[PDB]
């Protein structure tokens, strides 16, 4: 019941010659895969771990100054110098002051002045990095039977958690009663962690671009420094003020925690307290169903009386789930489940819980099925005591096609050119489309890198207008397509 | 001389007494006794249930 109830559920149906299928697993989503003669499975990516992170900078978000020193030279005598001006733990600046007989110089001009203060860091943000080889994705595979997933502290015989790492990217999960499932994942084509930084603030962490992290205008330490005292852009966290030309002072600019939070908008928040846990991103895996068989296919129909212990509840994916107990003989038996019309003359829906069986008499089993969009009837059992359950589905086929197309477009928006692997069975059209998407995505990412969603909307409108007011028909169509796609991406971006 | 306070802005805060309430699908909106108090910051959202 975990994959049911997740709005981002995905239905992957079919396998190629070879009983494998390509699926992309996201952290907030679920993939339910159905084959012609295979048990339905639920796939969730529940944990991404980065191990042994290495720091590369320690930007300072709050500093202070303690030893302010000033040096002055009378006018015409050149710039002054301070000993601290060669100290790297000191911030210095050169300016001018008005000098004369009253001041104490004796030459009536503008004398150079330099003030230096010791820069000390009170709070910093660590930009750790991880090697792409140190990632570890945890994926749970559940056989999606009506069988209850069990309660904790006693048994975990239902969920199967397989850890995937770049070194061991091919792993096998032995699902009790269903054979084994082999996942051939490619964790090296996920986030590209070589260009990512694990940015950890006081108690919060984000996953951020590495060039963005290296371009931050705060003082930083190289990350190999244990004593600090060698901050680089100390000038960015201090302000030197010479009101008029009388006295030169310096002060710190205050805690940059809130400004940094504002700067982190659009960065996904990760966890870095007890290890580096990333509940964000996807994983492309190839799923092998060769050694995966339905459980209890050598069973006879129950020929008993079922009772619905939990009324039919509709999910947000178009299917229905019903909870039925069994009061009959021959406990391990197949459940006679059909979804027909009123006259029981046609089979209208398909139960996506393929081969429901009753392991124990009083143990309830909850079947999931996909009824048709019209009126339909769920028939459970055989002639003596048969249950006929009416149900009505509100949608329509045209609406379903629209929603499926929208979900595909959204998948392309997030997994640009990796969406082609979401339910691919190999194919040649899929390969050609993936190559074309890779080229177009390279061009689009080059032309739209670092641009906000409002800028994307503006550029899309401009390009659409240029295309509409174009001489060439082919150029007009291409520009209109580019503009409309840009508008869709700017409306769907920053999520 | 003799200044008068016009407004007092908050630059640093702390959040405590965090509490959540939920009303599952189609049954309306959740209720927190904290929403009656104006020193609590509140937000409404939907979760999958």
């Amino acid at each position: 019941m975990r994959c049911i109830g997740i709005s981002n559920r995905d239905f992957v149906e079919g396998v190629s010659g070879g009983s494998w299928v390509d699926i992309v697993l996201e952290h907030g989503s679920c993939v339910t895969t159905m084959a012609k003669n295979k048990p339905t499975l639920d796939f969730e990516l529940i944990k991404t771990e980065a191990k042994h992170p290495a720091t590369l900078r320690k930007y300072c978000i709050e500093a202070k100054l303690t030893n302010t020193t000033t040096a002055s030279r009378c006018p015409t005598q050149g710039e002054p110098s301070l000993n601290e001006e060669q100290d790297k733990r000191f911030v210095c600046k050169h300016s001018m002051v008005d000098r004369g007989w009253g001041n104490g110089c004796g030459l009536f001009g503008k004398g150079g002045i330099v003030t230096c203060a010791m820069f000390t860091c009170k709070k910093n943000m660590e930009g750790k990095i991880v090697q792409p080889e140190n990632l570890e994705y945890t994926i749970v595979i559940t056989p999606h039977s009506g069988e209850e997933n069990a309660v904790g502290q006693d048994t975990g015989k239902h969920g199967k958690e397989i850890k995937v790492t770049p070194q061991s990217s091919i792993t096998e999960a032995e699902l009790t009663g269903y054979g084994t499932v082999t996942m051939e994942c490619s964790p090296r084509t996920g986030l590209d962690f070589n260009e990512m930084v694990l940015l950890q603030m006081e108690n919060k962490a984000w996953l951020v671009h590495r060039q963005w992290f290296l371009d931050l205008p705060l003082p930083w330490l190289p990350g190999a420094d244990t004593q600090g005292s060698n901050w680089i852009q100390k000038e960015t966290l201090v302000t030197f003020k010479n009101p008029h030309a009388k006295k030169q002072d310096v002060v710190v600019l205050g805690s940059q925690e809130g400004a940094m939070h504002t700067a982190l908008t659009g960065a996904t928040e990760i966890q870095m307290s007890s290890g580096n846990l990333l509940f964000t991103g996807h994983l492309k895996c190839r799923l092998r169903m060769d050694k995966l068989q339905l459980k209890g296919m050598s069973y006879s129909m129950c020929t008993g009386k079922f009772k619905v212990v939990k009324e039919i509840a509709e999910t947000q994916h178009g299917t229905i789930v019903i909870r039925v107990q069994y009061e009959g003989d021959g406990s391990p038996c197949k459940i006679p489940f059909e979804i027909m019309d009123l006259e029981k003359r046609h089979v209208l829906g398909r139960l996506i819980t393929v081969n429901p069986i009753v392991t124990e008499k009083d143990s309830p089993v909850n079947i999931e099925a996909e009824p048709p969009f019209g009126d339909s009837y769920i028939i459970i059992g055989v002639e003596p005591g048969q249950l006929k359950l009416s149900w009505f589905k509100k949608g329509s086929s045209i609406g379903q096609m629209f929603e499926t197309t929208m979900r595909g477009a959204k998948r392309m928006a997030i997994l640009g050119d990796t969406a082609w692997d979401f339910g691919s069975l190999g194919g040649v059209f899929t390969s050609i489309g993936k190559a074309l998407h890779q080229v177009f995505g390279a061009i689009y990412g080059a032309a739209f890198s670092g641009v906000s969603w409002t800028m994307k909307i503006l550029i899309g409108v401009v390009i659409t207008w240029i295309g509409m007011n174009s001489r060439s028909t082919s150029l007009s169509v291409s520009l209109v397509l580019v503009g409309v796609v840009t508008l869709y991406l700017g409306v769907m971006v920053q999520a | 001389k003799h200044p008068a306070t016009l407004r007092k802005y908050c630059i640093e805060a702390k959040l405590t007494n965090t509490t959540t309430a939920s009303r599952c699908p189609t049954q309306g909106e959740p209720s927190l006794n904290e929403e009656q108090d104006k020193r609590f910051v509140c937000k409404h959202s939907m979760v999958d249930r």
Epitope: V151, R323 | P30, R49
Partner: antibody, heavy 119, light 110 residues
Framework: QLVESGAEVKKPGSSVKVSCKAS????????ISWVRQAPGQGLEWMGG????????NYAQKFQGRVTITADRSTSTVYMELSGLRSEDTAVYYC??????????????WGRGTLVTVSS | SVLTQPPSASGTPGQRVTISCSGS????????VYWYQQLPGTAPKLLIY???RRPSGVPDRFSGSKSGTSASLAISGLRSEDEADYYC???????????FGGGTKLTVLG
């Protein structure tokens, strides 16, 4: 991993709040229900709540008389009983259960707070 | 209504004893049945969860039975330890709440 509040002796017509402090794992992963056992009487279910979700449900006998809430910051669950009376005297328990709507297996319990309605 | 349960139970050490809890179509026979042992001056302990599945804590001698509209708890071997109040708790769909039984005080002779 579940610790309840200390003993409380109250007076008729008052209101009593009971504290049950769970751990982080039990707060974000399990539900917590309030069962009160009257002196020399059987167990009774008052209500429960999914602390992470916070929507509380109560027995039909306790509508408008019991309030159950969670403090996600301190990871605590509270039960507040209004209109305390002679029959409200009992021991109160907080138990940890899964947040599924079918399983009520209390594999963890506190120690009970004796809400003694007397002098 | 509530799960009717036998107020009085009696047994002798070394003897197998079971407790009967009868509910309605919405109390029992439509929801899992949980059995709890509550000794005097102590909080109830979960004896069998789901439909008569033993938690690791309870020894194998403990077990329970579930039927169409009633449940039962089986004791393999008997002792003075089984002298306590017994409760059968099950979610009621109509009552919309976890409704225990009336409570069975099991008395062990000796």
């Amino acid at each position: 991993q579940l610790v309840e509040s200390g003993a409380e002796v109250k007076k008729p017509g008052s209101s009593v709040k009971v504290s049950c402090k769970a751990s982080g794992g039990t707060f974000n992963n399990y539900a917590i229900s309030w069962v009160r056992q009257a002196p020399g009487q059987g167990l009774e279910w008052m209500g429960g709540i999914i602390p992470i979700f916070g929507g509380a449900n109560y027995a039909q006998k306790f509508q408008g008389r019991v309030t159950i809430t969670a403090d996600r910051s301190t990871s605590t669950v509270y039960m507040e009983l209004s209109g305390l009376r002679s029959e409200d005297t009992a021991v109160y328990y907080c138990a940890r259960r899964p947040q599924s709507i079918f399983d009520w297996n209390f594999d963890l319990w506190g120690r009970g707070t004796l809400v003694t309605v007397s002098s | 209504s509530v799960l009717t349960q036998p107020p009085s139970a009696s047994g002798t050490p070394g003897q197998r004893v079971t407790i009967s809890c009868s509910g309605s179509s919405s109390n029992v026979g439509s929801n899992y049945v949980y059995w709890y042992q509550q000794l005097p001056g102590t909080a109830p302990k979960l004896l069998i969860y789901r439909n008569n599945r033993r938690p690791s804590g309870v020894p194998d001698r403990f077990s329970g039975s579930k039927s169409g509209t009633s449940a039962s708890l089986a004791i393999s071997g008997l002792r003075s330890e089984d002298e306590a109040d017994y409760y059968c708790a099950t979610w009621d769909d109509s009552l919309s709440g976890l409704v225990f039984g009336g409570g069975t005080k099991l008395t062990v002779l000796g």
